[PDB]
Amino acid sequence: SSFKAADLQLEMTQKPHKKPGPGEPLVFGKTFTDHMLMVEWNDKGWGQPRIQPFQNLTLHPASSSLHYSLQLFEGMKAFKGKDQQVRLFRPWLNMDRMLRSAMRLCLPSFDKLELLECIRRLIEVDKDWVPDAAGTSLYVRPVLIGNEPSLGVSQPTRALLFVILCPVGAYFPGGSVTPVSLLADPAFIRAWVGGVGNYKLGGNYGPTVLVQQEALKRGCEQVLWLYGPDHQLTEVGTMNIFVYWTHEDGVLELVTPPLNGVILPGVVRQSLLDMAQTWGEFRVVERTITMKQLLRALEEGRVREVFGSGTACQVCPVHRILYKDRNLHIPTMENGPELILRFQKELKEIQYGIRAHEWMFPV
Amino acid sequence: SSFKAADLQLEMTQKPHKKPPLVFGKTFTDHMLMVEWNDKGWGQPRIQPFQNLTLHPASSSLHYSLQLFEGMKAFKGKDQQVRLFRPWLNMDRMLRSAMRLCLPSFDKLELLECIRRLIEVDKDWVPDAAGTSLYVRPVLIGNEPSLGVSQPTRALLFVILCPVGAYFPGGSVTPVSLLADPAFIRAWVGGVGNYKLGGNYGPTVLVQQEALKRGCEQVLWLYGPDHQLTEVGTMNIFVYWTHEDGVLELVTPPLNGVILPGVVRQSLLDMAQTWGEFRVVERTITMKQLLRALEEGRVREVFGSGTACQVCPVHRILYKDRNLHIPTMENGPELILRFQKELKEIQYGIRAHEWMFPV
Numbered sequence A: 001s002s003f004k005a006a007d008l009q010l011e012m013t014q015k016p017h018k019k020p021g022p023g024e025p026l027v028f029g030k031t032f033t034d035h036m037l038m039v040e041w042n043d044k045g046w047g048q049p050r051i052q053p054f055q056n057l058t059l060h061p062a063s064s065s066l067h068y069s070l071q072l073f074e075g076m077k078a079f080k081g082k083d084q085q086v087r088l089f090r091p092w093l094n095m096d097r098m099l100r101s102a103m104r105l106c107l108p109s110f111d112k113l114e115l116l117e118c119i120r121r122l123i124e125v126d127k128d129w130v131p132d133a134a135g136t137s138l139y140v141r142p143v144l145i146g147n148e149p150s151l152g153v154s155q156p157t158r159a160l161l162f163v164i165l166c167p168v169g170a171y172f173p174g175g176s177v178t179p180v181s182l183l184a185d186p187a188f189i190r191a192w193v194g195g196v197g198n199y200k201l202g203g204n205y206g207p208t209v210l211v212q213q214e215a216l217k218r219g220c221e222q223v224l225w226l227y228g229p230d231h232q233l234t235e236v237g238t239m240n241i242f243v244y245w246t247h248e249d250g251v252l253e254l255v256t257p258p259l260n261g262v263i264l265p266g267v268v269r270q271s272l273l274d275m276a277q278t279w280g281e282f283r284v285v286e287r288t289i290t291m292k293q294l295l296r297a298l299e300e301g302r303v304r305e306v307f308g309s310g311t312a313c314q315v316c317p318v319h320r321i322l323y324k325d326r327n328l329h330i331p332t333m334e335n336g337p338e339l340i341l342r343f344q345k346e347l348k349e350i351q352y353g354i355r356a357h358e359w360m361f362p363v
Numbered sequence B: 001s002s003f004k005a006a007d008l009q010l011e012m013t014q015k016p017h018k019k020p021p022l023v024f025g026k027t028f029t030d031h032m033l034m035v036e037w038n039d040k041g042w043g044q045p046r047i048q049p050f051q052n053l054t055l056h057p058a059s060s061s062l063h064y065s066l067q068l069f070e071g072m073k074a075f076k077g078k079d080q081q082v083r084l085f086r087p088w089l090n091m092d093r094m095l096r097s098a099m100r101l102c103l104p105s106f107d108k109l110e111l112l113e114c115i116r117r118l119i120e121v122d123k124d125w126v127p128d129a130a131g132t133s134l135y136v137r138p139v140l141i142g143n144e145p146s147l148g149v150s151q152p153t154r155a156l157l158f159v160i161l162c163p164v165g166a167y168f169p170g171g172s173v174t175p176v177s178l179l180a181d182p183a184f185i186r187a188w189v190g191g192v193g194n195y196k197l198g199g200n201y202g203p204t205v206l207v208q209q210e211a212l213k214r215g216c217e218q219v220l221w222l223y224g225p226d227h228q229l230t231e232v233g234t235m236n237i238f239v240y241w242t243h244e245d246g247v248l249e250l251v252t253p254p255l256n257g258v259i260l261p262g263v264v265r266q267s268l269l270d271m272a273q274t275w276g277e278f279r280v281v282e283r284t285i286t287m288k289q290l291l292r293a294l295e296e297g298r299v300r301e302v303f304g305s306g307t308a309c310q311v312c313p314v315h316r317i318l319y320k321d322r323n324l325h326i327p328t329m330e331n332g333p334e335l336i337l338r339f340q341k342e343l344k345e346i347q348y349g350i351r352a353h354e355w356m357f358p359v
Ligand SMILES: Cc1c(C(=O)Nc2ccccc2CC(=O)O)sc2nc[nH]c(=O)c12
Pocket: A028, A075, A139, A168, A169, A170, A171, A205, A238, A239, A309, A310, A311, A312, A313, B147, B148, B149
């Protein structure tokens, strides 16, 4: 059985460090809060969870986390409203995803609600680290790793679950959408049907570093991940992809690829579908999108906006795709971008507690 | 640039562990190699007592799988002399893996010499009973304390050693049965299956469990709509058969992106080519080709190759819920035994060979 929040052990720090100031620009992900969550698993089950001072991990050099990538992570944001209340965005969905990732790598199960409560308690302890300036947030990074001291390629009998926290400044410095250019080269494949691209596993990210460098060398900012003989658009970098257009049947539509194995089921992605479906103003579908369809829609002036979704920026416009040595101008910014702006506005209102919503989990 | 073996620092253990049954991969020797890389380049390499790693919780090795490894064996002959099998090839492969993950390059011969010195320090750990060896596990990991999905500015290269028992205890070769289900995919063209990266292995644990549930020891990894045979577990696959053109041949899949280029694999090709007794070819092999050849009695032996076992016969493949009998063992298995014997004689120093690197 799972670790329990009722069993939480707490150790407050004695060497708190300076919090970064809002005036200094932060590169993402290098500054951490004072405490962390740690829980250890062995064949007899989970130990008691603990909130402890941020500190190093001590791992056996044969730890399967480091040899066979028995590792997975999550990523979600907590937001502090003007009322000073801290709230997590739809964290239940992150817990569901984390558990699915754990089962895929034969890592131990845990109770999703017990972990969520332990994370709440951690953020509570480090509440002062949650910034409240516009467009700022606290990024929460749960990790589960195998930790068997053995070179056998096997299900581990030991594991570690920890959570660390990282305050974040504004993704769009200035407070306004900045479009990105994408390299679409079918030679690079992020994930395959039957593979593990639909789980947030460490192994899906390391191989992308070189491909992202290649995008930069070709004058693009991010990678448009193509899949199959028909060059399906799957994801943009570490963002889910959305296209807002009049479809071939003449109907105004928001489409994003379906969860058929090569798509990471984004929490923001699900939220944009939920939100747009609720409005009931245009068709909202999950369907494959091909480069042939995009090329045709662009030539016929049917595309309004293309954008990525994710925790990192919420919604990110795309203005250009480099495909088969040709630049495709995507007219997103010449169309408002109305839908992008609307999503950003309504997400912000929910996230910073301007309007109450069941999507927000209060800390 | 590179760390230099000339700068190697040695610190001997003050708490030596009692030496050695042996389940693979759980027993380690007294010392390890460690080298750190940061913005000032590579530090000096050190041999230190076996000990835990201390890693920042944001270390990119644990979040984005910036990790790769190697595996090679040292063997102790009757002359008590220890020798590594074709280690230059492992160094070449390690460097290819490092470049693929944007990890720092190093000089292959400098690493090789540091590894030689490590094994030398722990030489009494190398067993000398029949079929036994010392397994050498170099690892290179990213070590940036950042959640950015980026090329690291810090890294760690370490090497640990395991004594290993006989793969076929008692000497008799025993075949493996395979589950062949196209639902499972190990790697894809445009992926990273041809590098020895940690990320390729974690995902196979659940698949292997499913094979065992279906009463099979290992996974036959199929690829493409034509069900190309790619690998057997973590072994390269060979088929010894009379081909459709009437010619007796040894075939293994080509290095087209989904095949990890094994050192033993390359060695079997080299050895068979040297014999000049039958055709040796790298060619795609499909399940339909295999089924036809089996129906027509053209298959002699099917086997996997790898550092773990050198060679391992296959006698059964479960495909589309049907058991395919592979007549490997009924055929000796003559070729498998021949490869096994020659490799053994080379590895334990019974016959001189440039493939062996003395420690
Ligand atoms: C969260 C985040 C970044 C990131 O790399 N995230 C990430 C990491 C691994 C896999 C997927 C993702 C995608 C995701 O968080 O949406 S870069 C970044 N820049 C500014 N502000 C942010 O909040 C931020």
